[PDB]
Amino acid sequence: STRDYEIQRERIELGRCIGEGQFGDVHQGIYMSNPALAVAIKTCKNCTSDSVREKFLQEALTMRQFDHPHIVKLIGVITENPVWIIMELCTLGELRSFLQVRKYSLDLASLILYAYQLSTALAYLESKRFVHRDIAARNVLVSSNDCVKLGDFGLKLPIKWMAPESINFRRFTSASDVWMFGVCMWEILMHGVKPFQGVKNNDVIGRIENGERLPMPPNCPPTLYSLMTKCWAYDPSRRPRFTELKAQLSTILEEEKAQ
Numbered sequence: 001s002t003r004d005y006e007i008q009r010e011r012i013e014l015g016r017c018i019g020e021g022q023f024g025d026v027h028q029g030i031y032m033s034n035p036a037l038a039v040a041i042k043t044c045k046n047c048t049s050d051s052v053r054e055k056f057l058q059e060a061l062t063m064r065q066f067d068h069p070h071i072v073k074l075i076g077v078i079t080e081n082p083v084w085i086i087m088e089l090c091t092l093g094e095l096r097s098f099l100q101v102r103k104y105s106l107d108l109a110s111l112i113l114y115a116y117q118l119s120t121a122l123a124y125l126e127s128k129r130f131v132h133r134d135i136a137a138r139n140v141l142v143s144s145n146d147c148v149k150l151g152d153f154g155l156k157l158p159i160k161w162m163a164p165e166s167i168n169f170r171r172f173t174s175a176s177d178v179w180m181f182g183v184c185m186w187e188i189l190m191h192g193v194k195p196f197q198g199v200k201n202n203d204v205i206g207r208i209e210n211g212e213r214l215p216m217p218p219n220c221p222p223t224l225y226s227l228m229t230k231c232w233a234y235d236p237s238r239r240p241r242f243t244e245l246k247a248q249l250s251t252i253l254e255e256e257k258a259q
């Protein structure tokens with residue numbers, strides 16, 4: 001039930017389209033509540049069929065259960081047609097593009113901060129025993145210069161980001177997540193460059209079994225690259241826990257900020 005966070009439509013002013021989620025466009029809006037607050041609104045294209053509506057609204061019921069500095073907050077829902085999900089707005093958009101445009105204006109400490117930040121959230125999700133089953137929707141958003149957040153919308157499987165066991169047996173565990181986090185970390189230090197550029201998806205799995213890994217990013221600290229490669233151990237029982245990563249990242253950030 002949603003009655004404790006049902007929003008009245010007139011309190012929401014739907015603005016410009018800003019991205020796409022799995023179910024429809026995402027809009028910017030102003031929500032008159034405290035203030036008259038900037039929000040992100042998930043919309044739903046074909047919520048005119050019942051089954052799509054159930055799954056769209058499930059995204060909200062799920063988000064509702066978490067409260068963390070680095071996971072996108074649910075503000076509310078409107079459950080009459082047309083159905084909307086009202087989320088906090090991450091002003092500065094997608095991390096990938098953010099890192100690219102800011103390649104020459106973000107220091108190493110910030111890039112590490114982001115990785116650390118995400119690991120605190122992933123550790124929380126692990127402690128809440130959440131299984132995120134929609135891997136294609138996984139994305140990172142920037143709410144400010146010093147704050148990134150997990151989300152399932154933007155501002156077909158990710159073969160290139162996936163653990164080999166996910167690829168061969170469709171096994172998805174806390175460990176496969178760690179593998180993907182490893183890639184996401186690499187991505188961050190590479191200023192939002194995607195993994196395996198030019199390489200075909202099907203030739204990916206072969207290269208991994210051959211011992212090949214994504215190389216050390218320019219200016220990436222050997223301590224942090226070591227963390228990454230541990231995220232990419234083949235035997236998924238060799239990979240570190242997120243709680244292991246949160247801590248290991250915490251002292252790496254301290255080493256840099258001290259310089």
Ligand SMILES: CCc1ccc(-c2ccc3c(c2)-c2c(cnn2CC)S(=O)(=O)N3C)cc1
Nearest residue numbers: 063125132138139150151152177180181184
């Ligand atoms: C609030 C629901 C929710 C939506 C998306 C995620 C999300 C977003 C991005 C992710 C991830 C999750 C993610 C990663 C590794 N494991 N997981 C699942 C917890 S990741 O590689 O850091 N990555 C890109 C988590 C919760």
